[PDB]
PDB file of C-alpha atoms and ligand atoms in Angstrom:
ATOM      1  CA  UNK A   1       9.546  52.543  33.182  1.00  0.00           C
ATOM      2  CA  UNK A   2       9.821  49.879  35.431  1.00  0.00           C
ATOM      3  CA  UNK A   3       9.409  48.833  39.071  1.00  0.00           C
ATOM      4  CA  UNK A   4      12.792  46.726  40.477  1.00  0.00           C
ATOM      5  CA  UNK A   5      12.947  43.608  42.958  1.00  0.00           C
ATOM      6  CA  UNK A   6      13.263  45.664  46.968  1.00  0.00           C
ATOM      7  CA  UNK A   7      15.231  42.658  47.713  1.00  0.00           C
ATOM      8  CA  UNK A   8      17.146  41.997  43.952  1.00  0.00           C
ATOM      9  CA  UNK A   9      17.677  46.095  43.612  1.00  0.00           C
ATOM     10  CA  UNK A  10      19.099  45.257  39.810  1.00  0.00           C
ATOM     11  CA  UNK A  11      16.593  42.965  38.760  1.00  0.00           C
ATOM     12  CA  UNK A  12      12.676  44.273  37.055  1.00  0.00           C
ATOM     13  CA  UNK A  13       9.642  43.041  38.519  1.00  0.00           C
ATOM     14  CA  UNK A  14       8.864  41.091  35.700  1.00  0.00           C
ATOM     15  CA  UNK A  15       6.723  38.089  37.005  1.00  0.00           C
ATOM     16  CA  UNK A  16       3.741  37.476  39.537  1.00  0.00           C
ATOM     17  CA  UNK A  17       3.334  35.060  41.889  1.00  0.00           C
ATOM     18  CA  UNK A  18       0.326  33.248  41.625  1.00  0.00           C
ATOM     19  CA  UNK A  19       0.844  31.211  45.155  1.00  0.00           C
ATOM     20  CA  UNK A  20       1.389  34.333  47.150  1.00  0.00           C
ATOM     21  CA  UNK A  21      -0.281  36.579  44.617  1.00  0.00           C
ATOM     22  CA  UNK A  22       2.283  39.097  44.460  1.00  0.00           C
ATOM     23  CA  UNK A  23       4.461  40.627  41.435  1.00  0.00           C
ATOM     24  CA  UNK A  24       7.856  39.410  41.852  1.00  0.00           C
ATOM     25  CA  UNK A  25      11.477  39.377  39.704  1.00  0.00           C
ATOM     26  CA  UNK A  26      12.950  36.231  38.053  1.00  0.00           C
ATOM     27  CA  UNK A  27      15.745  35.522  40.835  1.00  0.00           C
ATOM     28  CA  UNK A  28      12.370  35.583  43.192  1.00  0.00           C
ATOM     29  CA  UNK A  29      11.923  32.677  41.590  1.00  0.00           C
ATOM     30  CA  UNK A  30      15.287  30.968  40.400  1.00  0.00           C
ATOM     31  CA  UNK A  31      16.763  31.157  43.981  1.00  0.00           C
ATOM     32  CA  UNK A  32      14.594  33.411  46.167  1.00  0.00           C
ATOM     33  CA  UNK A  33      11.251  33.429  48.297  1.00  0.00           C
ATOM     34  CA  UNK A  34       9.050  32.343  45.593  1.00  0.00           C
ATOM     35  CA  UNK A  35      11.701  29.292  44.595  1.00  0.00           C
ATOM     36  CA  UNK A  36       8.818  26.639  45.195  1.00  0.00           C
ATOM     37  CA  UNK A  37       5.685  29.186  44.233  1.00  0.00           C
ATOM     38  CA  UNK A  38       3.771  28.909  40.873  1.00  0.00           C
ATOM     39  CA  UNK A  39       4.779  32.083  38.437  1.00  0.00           C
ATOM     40  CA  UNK A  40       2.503  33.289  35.321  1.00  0.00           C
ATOM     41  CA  UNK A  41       4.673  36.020  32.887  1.00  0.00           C
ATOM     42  CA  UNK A  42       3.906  40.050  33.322  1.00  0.00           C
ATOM     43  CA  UNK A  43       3.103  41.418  29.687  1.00  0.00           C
ATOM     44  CA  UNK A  44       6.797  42.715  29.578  1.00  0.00           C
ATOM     45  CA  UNK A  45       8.242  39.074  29.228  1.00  0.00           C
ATOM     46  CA  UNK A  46       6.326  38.453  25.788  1.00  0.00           C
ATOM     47  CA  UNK A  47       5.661  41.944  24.606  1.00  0.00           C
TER      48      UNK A  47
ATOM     49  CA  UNK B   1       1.844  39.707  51.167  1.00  0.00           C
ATOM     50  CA  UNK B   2       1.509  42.752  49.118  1.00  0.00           C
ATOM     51  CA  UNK B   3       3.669  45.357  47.581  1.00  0.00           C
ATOM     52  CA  UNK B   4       2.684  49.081  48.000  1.00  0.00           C
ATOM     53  CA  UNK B   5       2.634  51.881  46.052  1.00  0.00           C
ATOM     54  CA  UNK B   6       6.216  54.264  46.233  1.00  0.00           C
ATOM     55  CA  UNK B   7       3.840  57.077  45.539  1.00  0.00           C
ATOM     56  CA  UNK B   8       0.493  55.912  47.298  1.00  0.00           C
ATOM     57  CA  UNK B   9       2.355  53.925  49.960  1.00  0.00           C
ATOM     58  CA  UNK B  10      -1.249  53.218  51.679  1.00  0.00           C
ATOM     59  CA  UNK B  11      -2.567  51.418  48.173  1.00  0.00           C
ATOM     60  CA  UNK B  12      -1.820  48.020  47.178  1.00  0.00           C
ATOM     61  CA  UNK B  13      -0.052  47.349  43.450  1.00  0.00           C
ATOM     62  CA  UNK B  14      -3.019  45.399  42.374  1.00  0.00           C
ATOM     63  CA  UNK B  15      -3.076  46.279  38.587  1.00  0.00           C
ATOM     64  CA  UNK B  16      -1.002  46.116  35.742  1.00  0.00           C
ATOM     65  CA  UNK B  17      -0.685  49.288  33.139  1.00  0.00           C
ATOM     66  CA  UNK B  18      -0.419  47.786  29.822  1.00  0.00           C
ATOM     67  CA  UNK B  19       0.351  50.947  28.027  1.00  0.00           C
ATOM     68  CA  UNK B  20       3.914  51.477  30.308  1.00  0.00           C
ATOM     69  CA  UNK B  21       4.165  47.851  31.048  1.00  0.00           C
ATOM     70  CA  UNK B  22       4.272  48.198  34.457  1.00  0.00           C
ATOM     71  CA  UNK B  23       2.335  46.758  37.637  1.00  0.00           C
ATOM     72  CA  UNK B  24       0.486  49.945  39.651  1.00  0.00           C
ATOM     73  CA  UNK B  25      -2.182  50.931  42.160  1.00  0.00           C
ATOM     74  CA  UNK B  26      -6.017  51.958  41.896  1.00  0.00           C
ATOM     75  CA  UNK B  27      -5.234  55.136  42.574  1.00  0.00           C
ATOM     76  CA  UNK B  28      -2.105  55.490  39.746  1.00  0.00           C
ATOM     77  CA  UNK B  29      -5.096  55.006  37.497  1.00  0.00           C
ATOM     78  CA  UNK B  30      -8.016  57.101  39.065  1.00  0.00           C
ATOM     79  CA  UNK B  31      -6.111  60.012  39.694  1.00  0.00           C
ATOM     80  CA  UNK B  32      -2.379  59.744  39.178  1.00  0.00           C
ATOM     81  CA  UNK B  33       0.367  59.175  36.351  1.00  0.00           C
ATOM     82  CA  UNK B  34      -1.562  56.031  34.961  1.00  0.00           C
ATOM     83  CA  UNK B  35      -5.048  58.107  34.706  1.00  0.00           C
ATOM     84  CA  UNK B  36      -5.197  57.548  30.859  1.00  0.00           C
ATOM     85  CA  UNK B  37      -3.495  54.546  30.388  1.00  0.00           C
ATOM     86  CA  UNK B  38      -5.194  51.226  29.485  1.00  0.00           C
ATOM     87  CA  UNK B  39      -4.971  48.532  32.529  1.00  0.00           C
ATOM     88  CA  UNK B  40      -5.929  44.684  33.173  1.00  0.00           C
ATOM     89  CA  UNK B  41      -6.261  43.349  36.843  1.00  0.00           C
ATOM     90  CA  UNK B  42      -3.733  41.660  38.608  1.00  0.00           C
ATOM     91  CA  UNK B  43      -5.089  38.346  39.650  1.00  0.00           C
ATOM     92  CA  UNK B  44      -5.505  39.330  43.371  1.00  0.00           C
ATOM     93  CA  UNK B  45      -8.523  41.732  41.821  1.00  0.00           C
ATOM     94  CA  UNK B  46     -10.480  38.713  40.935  1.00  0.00           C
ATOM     95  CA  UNK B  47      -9.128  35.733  43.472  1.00  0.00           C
TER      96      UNK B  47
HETATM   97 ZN1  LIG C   1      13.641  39.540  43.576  1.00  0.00          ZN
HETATM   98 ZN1  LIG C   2       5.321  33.015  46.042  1.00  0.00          ZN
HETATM   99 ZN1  LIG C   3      -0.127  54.522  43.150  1.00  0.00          ZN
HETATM  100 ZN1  LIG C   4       0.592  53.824  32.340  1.00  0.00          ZN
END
């Protein structure tokens, strides 16, 4: 069970935000809005 | 910025389960598919 990126449609939400305070997926963050934000992990990543 | 609920598209995702390992809303957990599932708060709870 898992909720996907609305923008990267193949990629989990798998990471939050903590500049915009939102969850968000890794490519968010590698090349997309969040590029510049600072991330923390969702459990999922070290479960 | 927020991301809503697909099933309670008025509620906010503003908690985590950590028994599916997925983000969800209050209500997922009050009344819904979450009801007896152990959460945390996403950091927006507490900000
Ligand atoms: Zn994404
Ligand atoms: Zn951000
Ligand atoms: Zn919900
Ligand atoms: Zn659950």
């Amino acid at each position: 069970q898992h909720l996907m990126c609305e923008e990267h449609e193949e990629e989990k939400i798998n990471i939050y935000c903590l500049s915009c305070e939102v969850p968000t997926c890794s490519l968010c963050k590698v090349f997309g809005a969040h590029k510049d934000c600072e991330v923390a992990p969702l459990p999922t990543i070290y479960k």
